[PDB]
Amino acid sequence: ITGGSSAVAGQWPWQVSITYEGVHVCGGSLVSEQWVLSAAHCFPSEHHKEAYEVKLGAHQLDSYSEDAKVSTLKDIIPHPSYLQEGSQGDIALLQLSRPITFSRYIRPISLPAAQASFPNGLHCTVTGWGHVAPSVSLLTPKPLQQLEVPLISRETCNSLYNIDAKPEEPHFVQEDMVCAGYVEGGKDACQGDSGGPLSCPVEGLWYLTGIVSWGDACGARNRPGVYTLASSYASWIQSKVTELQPR
Ligand SMILES: [Ca+2]
């Protein structure tokens, strides 16, 4: 996250770190005792399932914590419509190898209804342990960063992404995506934040409105963060989890 601030421990207790071969590569969001949501782009087919971990309950990634917990995965389920970089369907359900126990620091985020609308301009928060500027990693001990971002409709966002765009890039905010952020530079999610949550306030609670999707930009003007709408997959998530792990 560039242009944000440190969260405080426990503030975003659904935020998870996903690592591949021991290196943090993406965020994710805890949604039940055994399931996490992240982005499909974080799970390329050539990667090996057994090489992923998910760290829950963390604030400073590099610090010892008795509250953090690490898990492997027993299933990785990208939405089947996700085809290539920038595609719709950029969401993945991850089933932990074993269920975890919720705590002060590890709690699921509520998922929105299929037809939940989060209005343009709502101030949501994106969080992660990604880069704090282009090609600049978050410095150890890596406290979780957060950035408050107003929701930007996909229509406005597509017109911003057209400005000074590379002709050969599609930069397309799909029908299952929304944006959030600023037209000015300097405030954005960056490499390593993708897959993580856009948490929005509703009636005193927090919902997972979005999952950070595609992008190279880290703070460029006219490149607000692009997110997959969890609402676009509410039915698929409920169907999959109910069939695979009924409560
Ligand atoms: Ca970005």
The answer to whether domain 13-108+232-247 has CATH 2.40.10.10 is yes
Ligand 1: centre distance to CA 190 (Å):
5
Distance between CA atoms of 100 and 111, rounded to whole angstroms?
19
Q: Which residues pair with 2 in a beta bridge?
A: 188
| Single-letter residue type at 45 | S
Place of tokens 């692009």: 226
* Largest distance between two CA atoms of the chain: 49
238-246's contacts with Cβ under 8 Å and 24+ in sequence apart are 240/77, 240/93, 241/32, 241/35, 241/93, 244/75, 244/95, 245/34, 245/35, 245/95
State the DSSP code for 217. -
- Count how many residues are written for the chain: 247
Measured distance CA(14)–CA(179) in Å, rounded: 21
Query: 207, 199 in Cβ contact below 8 A?
Result: yes
246 Cα–ligand 1 center, Å: 36
> What are the residues whose beta carbon lies below 5 Å from ligand 1 (ion)?
188-189, 215, 217, 225
Burial grade of 150 (CB within 10 A; 0-12, 13-18, 19 or more): middle
Residues 6+ apart with CB under 8 A from 109: 14, 29, 30, 31, 197, 199, 206, 207, 208
Closest-CA residue to 191 (of 131, 236, 235) = 131
Give distance in angstroms: CA of 154 to centre of ligand 1.
15
Q: Would you list the DSSP string of 10-63?
A: TSSTTEEEEEETTEEEEEEEE-SSSEEEE-GGGS-TTS-GGGEEEEES-SBTTS
Residue 24: φ, ψ to 5°:
-60, 125
CA 186 to chain centre: 19
**At which residue do the structure tokens 């992404």 appear?**
161
Contact 115, 231 (CB under 8 A): yes
CB distance 229 to 114 below 8 Å = no
Give the torsion through C-alpha atoms of 172, 213, 177, 232, to 10 deg.
Answer: 140
Say how many Å lie between the CA of residue 97 and the centre of ligand 1: 31
Q: Compute the half-sphere exposure of residue 83: CA atoms within 13 Å on the CB side of its CA.
A: 4
Sign of CA dihedral 237, 94, 56, 224: negative
Tokens 């126990």 sit at which residue?
Answer: 101
Give the residue numbers annotated as catalytic, written as ranges. 41, 90, 194
Distance 225 CA to ligand 1 centre (A): 5
Ligand 1 centroid, distance to 99 Cα (angstroms): 32
1 C-alpha to ligand 1 centroid (Å) = 8
Which experiment gave this structure? X-ray
Half-sphere exposure of 170 (CA within 13 A, CB side): 9
β-pair type (92-96, 35-38): antiparallel
Domain ranges of the chain: 1-12+109-231, 13-108+232-247
Question: How large is the C-alpha radius of gyration of the chain?
Answer: 16
Output the CA torsion 173→174→176→180 (10° steps): 0
Tokens of 90: 């950029």
Asked if the domains 1-12+109-231 and 13-108+232-247 are classified in one and the same CATH topology, the answer is: yes
Beta-carbon contacts of 169 under 8 Å, excluding residues fewer than 6 positions away, are none
Structure tokens at 107: 């709690």
CA distance 103 to 51: 26
Beta bridge partners of 76: 94
Q: Is 3.50.50.60 the CATH number for 1-12+109-231?
A: no
Handedness of CA 71, 13, 102, 176 (dihedral sign): negative
Contact of 234 with 114, CB cutoff 8 Å: yes
